Amino acid sequence: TLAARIAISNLHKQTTKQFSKVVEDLYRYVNAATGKPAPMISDDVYNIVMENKDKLNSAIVYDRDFQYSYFGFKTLERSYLLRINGQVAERPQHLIMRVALGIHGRDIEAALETYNLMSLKYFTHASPTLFNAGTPKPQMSSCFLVAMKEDSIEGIYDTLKECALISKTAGGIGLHIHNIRSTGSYIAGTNGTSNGLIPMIRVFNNTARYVDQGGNKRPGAFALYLEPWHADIFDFIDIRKNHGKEEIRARDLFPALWIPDLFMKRVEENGTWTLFSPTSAPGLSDCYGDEFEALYTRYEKEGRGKTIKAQKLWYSILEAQTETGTPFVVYKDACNRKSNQKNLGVIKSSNLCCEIVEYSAPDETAVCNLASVALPAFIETSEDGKTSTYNFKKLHEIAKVVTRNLNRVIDRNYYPVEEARKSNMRHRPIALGVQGLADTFMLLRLPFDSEEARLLNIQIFETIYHASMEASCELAQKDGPYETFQGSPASQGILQFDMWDQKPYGMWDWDTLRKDIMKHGVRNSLTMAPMPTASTSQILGYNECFEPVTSNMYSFQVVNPYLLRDLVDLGIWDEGMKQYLITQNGSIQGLPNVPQELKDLYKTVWEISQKTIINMAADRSVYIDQSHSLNLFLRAPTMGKLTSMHFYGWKKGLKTGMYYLRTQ
Amino acid sequence: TLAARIAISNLHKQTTKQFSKVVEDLYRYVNAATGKPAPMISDDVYNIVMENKDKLNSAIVYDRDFQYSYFGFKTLERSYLLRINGQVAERPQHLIMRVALGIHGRDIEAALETYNLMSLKYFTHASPTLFNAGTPKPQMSSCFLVAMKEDSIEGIYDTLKECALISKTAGGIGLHIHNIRSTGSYIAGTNGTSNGLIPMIRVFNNTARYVDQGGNKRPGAFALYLEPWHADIFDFIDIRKNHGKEEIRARDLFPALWIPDLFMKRVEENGTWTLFSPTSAPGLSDCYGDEFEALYTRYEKEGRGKTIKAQKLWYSILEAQTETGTPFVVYKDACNRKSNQKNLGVIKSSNLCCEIVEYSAPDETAVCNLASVALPAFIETSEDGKTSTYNFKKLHEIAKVVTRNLNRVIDRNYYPVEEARKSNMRHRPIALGVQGLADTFMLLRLPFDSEEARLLNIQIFETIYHASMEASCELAQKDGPYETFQGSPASQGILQFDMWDQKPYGMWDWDTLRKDIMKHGVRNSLTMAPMPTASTSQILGYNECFEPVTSNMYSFQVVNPYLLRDLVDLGIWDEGMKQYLITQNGSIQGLPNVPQELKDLYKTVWEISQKTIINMAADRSVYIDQSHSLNLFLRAPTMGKLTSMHFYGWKKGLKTGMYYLRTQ
Ligand SMILES: Nc1nc2c(ncn2[C@H]2C[C@H](O)[C@@H](COP(=O)(O)OP(=O)(O)OP(=O)(O)O)O2)c(=O)[nH]1
Ligand SMILES: Nc1nc2c(ncn2[C@H]2C[C@H](O)[C@@H](COP(=O)(O)OP(=O)(O)OP(=O)(O)O)O2)c(=O)[nH]1
Ligand SMILES: Nc1ncnc2c1ncn2[C@@H]1O[C@H](COP(=O)(O)OP(=O)(O)O)[C@@H](O)[C@H]1O
Ligand SMILES: Nc1ncnc2c1ncn2[C@@H]1O[C@H](COP(=O)(O)OP(=O)(O)O)[C@@H](O)[C@H]1O
Ligand SMILES: [Mg+2]
Ligand SMILES: [Mg+2]
């Protein structure tokens, strides 16, 4: 609370003020232990700063360093602000201006615009952008989707190298492994027999541990995608389990299910399910929908697999989720049917956090560059005091700024492997997200589950998607559409909500936009992918992404500042209320002297129906090009409860049915 | 004992007799589980057999299947004889003839010669030759020496792939890792910090576990070589330790020390030793001898490393050996100074079993193809009964046959990776070994430590080396010398014993041989590398390689048949003697009623001075081109005992100071 106007002030005392001078320092840096020149700013950005020192220097408002809260600034200090010899060299304002120049380069007016908006907290860029923008090999991308190159030792080891090379320069991996022959399958070259996915997973697991994002930075982070017909699927879903059989676990990796609809139909019908090695039943992962169902059903009748009860796999899935939070669940058919990248081929995975849905092949590794809008920044006390409104015009404007930022990032990015460069330059996807939906609903006096909250949510996502496609259409008018625009749904006038067979809310003129996209193209294949903001929401001091709060009281004790405000205002905030928060996980339901309106506004995620979560997720999904990282939260978790959650999500047409399952 | 004329007879009953028909069966084989045609004989050998059926068929003596003892035949049955559907398809005679044709091809007379000699047990070929000769991709090599390609994620992962590809098709790896920067070392590309050798070792460890020699055959087997100046050396030598700190161990790998003389001098002088990351002190592994000492000493004075007490490392080395049997010890300077491959560059490792000393680089992976001579087969009861002599003329003849076999193997071999093919075709090294030295000494009534045993040992190795270079000189007269002959010691008339500055024993005419080699060349850079024969001595029913017996009684109970013979002959073999063998680890020292001559002849390895072992090892070493796998055996192991063993070996000029240390 006070710690901000203390710990920040101490940083000011221990850091140089003048931006161009912190830049000189970073640039002229020499690694003392080896005597090697180790510039922390690229030649390009250094020269830009030198040729514009007065302007950039004078544009910076250091007062804005106090926009950051205690843990927010401590997050920046620990991992974001550049360091010289373990001592922090940058102030937050300097980080921001460095990022702004790293994205925009010689376009100083665009950089100044981005500096102001970010320092004023209208939006931020994902962690690797904050870390690396304007440094010598700026790897600003967060996401890589990697295709297992071939069912062969050569292809497995080439993929492993690729993952190592990507993991070296920060970034999470989603890796699909559907094509790897399962246990017991014949090996012709040596007349041997395969031990299947696990011993292969363990190699990748060790690589994730080894290659810690650049040398003592962060352990490698890989999600693995598998379709539930793969014969190794029972051991795959348990890769994170805590209990014995150590040689069969891979605890540093995350399992994710790439679920076809057929699996869900067989589960609800109480039918059979057939497990195949991909060698016995080829092509299953390279088709989807009815075409998949026809092929699967044929392979099944031809006796090419091993049949079991579907609900046997289901119960095992549900068990692993209860225990480990994993595996994730992403619906293959929804992803494929409702993707603007469908003209590229069949999409075979999502990513580490289940928000990216992009096409990947042995020669093309999908990449994404992310940023999130701070939704609370667009609340304005109305033209009379007392009432608060939402500035949708400003949000539209900011999302357009951010779209343009993320395009610049594509072009200014350093790619770890050639497969990433090829993919990104061809299709140019981007990922806009949000943070502080919860804060926004609170500030505006809208309970998460209210009809008003439901409407705001819809109109916020409509405007972000509309803004991003409008900006992307603008860029295509200047620079041409992305290489692979023609043949795409968008080229035919088919936008995300159309693929859900829905009319848009209509806060914006979609027909003019469609006419414009059909005529001129768009510069980006995809624009929307709301992400966890697990670090960046911490920096800006908002609740992560689009989830309700998990607790009105975290840990240093910190109480929901909107709730705190209310309590003192009602003359009820005392010691007796603080006690009923430290033990009560931070809940205010049932509490003696508390207005009903506060109980409705400050429900914990554990007190909101997951049916409401799914509904609002399905609502916003119609304006998400890609997917979003939907955690599900269950207090008293049972199979029938879990089951209804998955099936409700599935029948809503969600792409990401579940990220983590959070429990207790 | 009787089990042979039982279990073999049952095999006869369950297998087809006619060779060409077992061949047809193997060739026409279809993998039932996939319906894939899976021929177990190459087109080439199949056609050779078909065009020569009467001759090959009729050459085979199936009575010779009874040359194999109980565990000997069980070893063949379990892992060597080809199988159709888990049922054994080959008889031992068929395996032999297949091998003979796999090596010799269209030269039927050479194949028949090899069939007779092998079936009569004059020699055998290493396991992968027995497994793969005459199959479709015959990978007949046992040894690969792999260079870590570069101190970079790219080079580390390329090396890992290479090891995977080699491990796929059977064969042990020696991998040198001297060039990998140690813990804490700077990483420029990401401004990070290295975690050193261990987390990298763990990746290779997992690969060894994964890639089990062709799919459920044998776990991968890698030795890692490191020079003791590397800064990670304390954790490296403990990679096999049993106790806690699991993330720091690599239990499926074998550590080996590549020791420069300087280390040994500093240890005995009670001096200092400096640990370097190879980045701070480049080139140490790419020189040896005085040149190394000059460079090392300069880097040391320039303050480029971390100094400790040498005997601190020494005591740690000695500790790990006591506990784990490892690390192995191979002297870099001896290897390099006394190698015919010295014109190639500096040799940076030995191999899995410490017998191969061959040059390797990022583009050249050294390979070796091995065979062993059964030394007991050359004992002849002299021209009067009663006295036994040794047929050195026959040994010379057989070693010439074997030399020619191993050359053919070079040319007929399937290479797993291109680096192996390049190396082997350029330099063509080969490795002859021996088995049943112990049996030979017993049969002839020579105790292992006697002056007579000492002399036989010398003259046996002189004749094998002489024979092999004579045969290799012959091949160079037909086919030209190996590509890299010129510049080599041998090209200058310098043979192994010369590099020890010694005169040969002189049982053979070395001057005529030298004149011939200098004039015509030799076809092979190296010819001698006596190996463990850990499996193949089991097949032939002899004691492994050149070691004394470990026990006059193994496990089924089996007593030293030469000792048993003696006891019954002296009318002392009874129950009271069998009891003093089941408990006494199989020793006959001190025993009440046993002649002194038997006590001297049937000493266990645990009862022979390791000074005698080292002496006889140093004696034969003068006729070994490469090195040999010298296990050391210590009953009551202490630091001062271990220390004298290492230093005695070192001062003798041994290359392989120690393979395993065997203890208790
Ligand atoms: N555990 C284990 N798996 C192996 C081994 N060798 C190959 N595999 C696995 C990796 C792949 O999933 C699959 C096929 O491997 P490769 O394509 O490298 O085998 P190859 O071409 O010799 O035979 P193929 O025609 O593919 O059946 O088998 C091995 O030695 N051990
Ligand atoms: N633990 C860990 N080690 C790494 C990582 N990245 C590289 N290394 C190790 C592997 C090599 O021994 C050494 C150098 O690696 P690279 O050559 O791939 O690094 P780079 O070229 O970016 O920097 P450099 O010029 O070599 O210092 O550092 C990492 O992310 N984590
Ligand atoms: N530990 C991690 N290591 C590497 N990448 C990560 C990690 N956590 C998340 N990511 C990447 O960042 C993306 C968005 O995650 P998010 O939690 O919004 O990150 P941040 O807020 O730190 O930018 C994910 O899709 C994932 O690819
Ligand atoms: N478990 C193993 N896996 C792979 N290769 C091995 C293994 N054991 C030994 N080798 C290889 O065989 C060579 C000689 O070993 P040896 O014990 O004589 O084998 P064999 O008698 O089975 O032919 C060694 O130098 C090594 O490279
Ligand atoms: Mg293959
Ligand atoms: Mg490098």
UniProtKB/Swiss-Prot annotation, chains A, B:
Record cross-link Glycyl lysine isopeptide (Lys-Gly) (interchain with G-Cter in ubiquitin), residues: K312
Record comment: activity regulation: Under complex allosteric control mediated by deoxynucleoside triphosphates and ATP binding to separate specificity and activation sites on the R1 subunit. The type of nucleotide bound at the specificity site determines substrate preference. It seems probable that ATP makes the enzyme reduce CDP and UDP, dGTP favors ADP reduction and dTTP favors GDP reduction. Stimulated by ATP and inhibited by dATP binding to the activity site. Inhibited by SML1.
Modified residues (Phosphoserine): S152
Reactions this protein catalyses: a 2'-deoxyribonucleoside 5'-diphosphate + [thioredoxin]-disulfide + H2O = a ribonucleoside 5'-diphosphate + [thioredoxin]-dithiol
Feature type site, description Important for electron transfer: Y659, Y660
EC number: 1.17.4.1
Temperature dependence per UniProt: Optimum temperature is 30 degrees Celsius.
Keyword terms of this UniProt record: Allosteric enzyme, ATP-binding, Cytoplasm, Deoxyribonucleotide synthesis, Disulfide bond, Isopeptide bond, Nucleotide-binding, Oxidoreductase, Phosphoprotein, Ubl conjugation
Major localization listed first in the record, in broad terms: cytoplasm
Example of a GO biological process term: deoxyribonucleotide biosynthetic process
Family: Belongs to the ribonucleoside diphosphate reductase large chain family.
Protein name in UniProt: Ribonucleoside-diphosphate reductase large chain 1
Organism of provenance: Saccharomyces cerevisiae (strain ATCC 204508 / S288c)
First and last residues shown, out of full length: 76 to 746 of 888
